[PDB]
């Protein structure tokens, strides 16, 4: 029960890379982790494929059946737009098998936590937080985070979902916005015209779930210190108010300097501090990836974070391995922040934190 579970198989990695949208990302992430020999220090668990019934715990039968149908051949289906397919989510080959593989991997991790096999279980290929019950959205065919949380609900009465991806985790928040059993906390860029457009600090959930959604809207250019100060302030209060029994943590690396999104200016060290703070609660914790469009930097980030989970210090030099040539121009693990300004006004941040502190008092 001591060592983290690492969700992995060569078949799963090949499947995760098989669509080539973020080409070879899963292989690069695993290969760097392997290059640093971190997998030796972890319990490698082969993921299972999600069954129809498991996927149906969140997604509608109509959506799953459509996804399954357009997956048989290539397939332009008249119903595809209704289901969010055709643009960011093309209806490709075994798209359904891809979705079920990713959904299954996160469920497997969750089941490992339930069975007490580990206290931390990692699926770096999961974290597809935008998908809705009946619609693909924002590159997400299926919401594995929701599927993971719903699996955890078999055992845990209160689950905290923390989303540190650059984007608002609207899909997970919406799934649980009416219930107090799951609190969702998203730190994200929030700006008119920036996807997905939701998640202002006034977004607090609905009905019985009111005040169980927490949103921290942040502006371009935030760096490690300020981000950690915000994240720690919110998590300290969320922990006190909500007393979570299990945590699902999404760590999308599109906040990291050098990402094409070019919005936040974080390094993996700052995200690592937030992760450290969550790890100290010593709860069952399900670790997911997410966005991250600079491949080398994303691998850098999730590898570093795996080190944080294992309590290891990694060498600064990127080890010789399959993708060593992608790590230019410095070929080191550290990431240097970009020279552009932090657009966050300290008093605006403080007002947001106060508003959140106020909301969390209602949590009972
Ligand atoms: O990593 C991401 N989230 O975690 C992500 C990145 C970019 C976009 C995204 C941004 C803007 C417009 C879009 C229009 C259609 C589909 C996706 C869009 C959506 C999500
Ligand atoms: K987020
Ligand atoms: Zn994102």
């Amino acid at each position: 029960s001591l060592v983290p579970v690492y969700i992995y198989s060569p078949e799963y990695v090949s499947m995760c890379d098989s669509l080539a949208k973020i080409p070879k990302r899963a292989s690069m992430v695993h290969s760097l982790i392997e290059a640093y020999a971190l997998h030796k220090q972890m319990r490698i668990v082969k993921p299972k494929v999600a069954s129809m019934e498991e996927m149906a715990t969140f997604h509608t039968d109509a959506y799953l059946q459509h996804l399954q149908k357009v997956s048989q051949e290539g397939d332009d289906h008249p119903d595809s737009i209704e289901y969010g397919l055709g643009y960011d989510c093309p209806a490709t080959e075994g798209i359904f098998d891809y979705a079920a593989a990713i959904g299954g991997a996160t469920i497997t991790a969750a089941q490992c936590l339930i069975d007490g096999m580990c206290k931390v279980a990692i699926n770096w290929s999961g974290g597809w937080h935008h998908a809705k019950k009946d619609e693909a959205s924002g590159f997400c065919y299926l919401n594995d985070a929701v599927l993971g949380i719903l699996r955890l609900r078999r055992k845990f009465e209160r689950i905290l979902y923390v989303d540190l991806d650059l984007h608002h985790g609207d899909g997970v928040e919406d799934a649980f916005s009416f219930t107090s059993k799951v609190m969702t906390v998203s730190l994200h860029k929030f700006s008119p015209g920036f996807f997905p457009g939701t998640g202002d600090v006034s977004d607090v959930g609905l009905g019985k779930g009111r005040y169980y959604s927490v949103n921290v809207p942040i502006q371009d250019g935030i760096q490690d210190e300020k981000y950690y100060q915000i994240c720690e302030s919110v998590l300290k209060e969320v922990y006190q108010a909500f007393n979570p029994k299990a945590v699902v943590l999404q760590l999308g690396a599109d906040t990291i300097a050098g990402d094409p999104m070019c919005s936040f200016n974080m390094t993996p060290v700052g995200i690592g501090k937030c992760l450290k703070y969550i790890l100290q609660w010593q709860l069952a914790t399900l670790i997911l990836g997410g966005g991250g469009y600079n491949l080398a930097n994303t691998a850098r980030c999730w590898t570093y974070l795996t080190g944080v989970i294992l309590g290891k210090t990694l060498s600064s030099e990127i080890p010789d391995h399959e993708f060593f040539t992608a790590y230019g121009p410095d070929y080191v693990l550290e990431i240097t922040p970009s020279c552009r300004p932090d657009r966050n006004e300290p008093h605006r941040i403080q007002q947001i934190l106060n508003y959140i502190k106020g909301n969390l008092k209602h949590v009972v």
Side-chain angles (χ1 to χ4, degrees), residues 277-299:
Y277 188 85
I278 291 170
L279 288 179
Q280 281 163 3
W281 292 336
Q282 301 195 55
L283 296 170
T285 304
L286 203 184
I287 307 288
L288 299 174
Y293 304 100
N294 181 312
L295 303 194
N297 275 12
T298 295

Side-chain angles (χ1 to χ4, degrees), residues 9-31:
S9 74
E11 296 77 25
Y12 176 60
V13 166
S14 304
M15 176 63 77
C16 287
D17 282 341
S18 67
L19 303 183
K21 281 202 285 176
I22 317 176
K24 299 171 183 50
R25 191 178 82 173
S27 177
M28 288 176 74
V29 167
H30 172 76
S31 72

Side-chain angles (χ1 to χ4, degrees), residues 59-102:
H59 294 285
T60 69
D61 288 331
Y63 173 52
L64 296 178
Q65 287 168 18
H66 184 88
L67 201 55
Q68 188 183 33
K69 165 62 177 50
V70 307
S71 182
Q72 310 300 102
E73 302 168 29
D75 209 343
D76 270 317
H77 201 282
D79 286 8
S80 274
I81 294 308
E82 180 174 358
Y83 292 123
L85 305 174
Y87 182 50
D88 52 292
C89 290
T92 345
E93 39 178 301
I95 200 50
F96 187 70
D97 302 304
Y98 168 91
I102 287 172

Side-chain angles (χ1 to χ4, degrees), residues 129 163-169 185-188:
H129 58 171
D163 192 312
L164 308 185
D165 186 285
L166 175 70
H167 298 88
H168 176 221
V185 171
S186 182
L187 280 63
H188 51 262

Side-chain angles (χ1 to χ4, degrees), residues 344-363:
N344 291 276
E345 285 288 25
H347 287 85
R348 178 55 190 173
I349 291 299
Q350 184 62 53
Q351 174 171 51
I352 286 168
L353 299 173
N354 295 342
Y355 189 105
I356 289 166
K357 185 217 189 303
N359 292 331
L360 291 176
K361 287 161 160 178
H362 291 85
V363 175

Side-chain angles (χ1 to χ4, degrees), residues 137-279:
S137 172
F139 298 116
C140 308
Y141 288 94
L142 169 141
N143 200 311
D144 65 291
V146 173
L147 293 186
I149 292 160
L150 290 180
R151 171 53 61 102
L152 292 170
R153 280 283 290 119
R154 288 192 181 187
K155 175 167 181 64
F156 303 97
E157 287 289 359
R158 290 184 310 281
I159 303 166
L160 174 65
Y161 172 74
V162 179
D163 192 312
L164 308 185
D165 186 285
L166 175 70
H167 298 88
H168 176 221
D170 61 336
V172 188
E173 168 193 287
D174 293 345
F176 301 110
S177 58
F178 284 93
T179 177
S180 58
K181 300 307 210 192
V182 178
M183 173 174 294
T184 58
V185 171
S186 182
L187 280 63
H188 51 262
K189 169 165 177 176
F190 179 86
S191 188
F194 188 82
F195 187 94
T198 49
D200 198 3
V201 67
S202 57
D203 175 356
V204 304
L206 301 160
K208 299 184 205 275
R210 183 164 158 87
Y211 308 116
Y212 291 79
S213 299
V214 172
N215 289 284
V216 191
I218 300 169
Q219 302 305 304
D220 278 349
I222 197 161
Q223 295 191 36
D224 292 330
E225 277 191 29
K226 188 57 158 180
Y227 190 98
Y228 180 72
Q229 287 164 357
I230 295 162
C231 188
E232 195 254 36
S233 295
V234 175
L235 293 187
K236 191 171 296 293
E237 292 167 346
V238 158
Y239 186 81
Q240 283 303 311
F242 184 65
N243 197 33
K245 289 299 215 150
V247 180
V248 177
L249 174 58
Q250 154 132 355
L251 301 170
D254 51 358
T255 56
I256 302 294
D259 189 281
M261 300 298 325
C262 199
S263 297
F264 290 181
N265 198 11
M266 294 298 289
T267 75
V269 178
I271 298 296
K273 294 192 66 166
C274 305
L275 167 64
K276 276 188 159 95
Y277 188 85
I278 291 170
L279 288 179

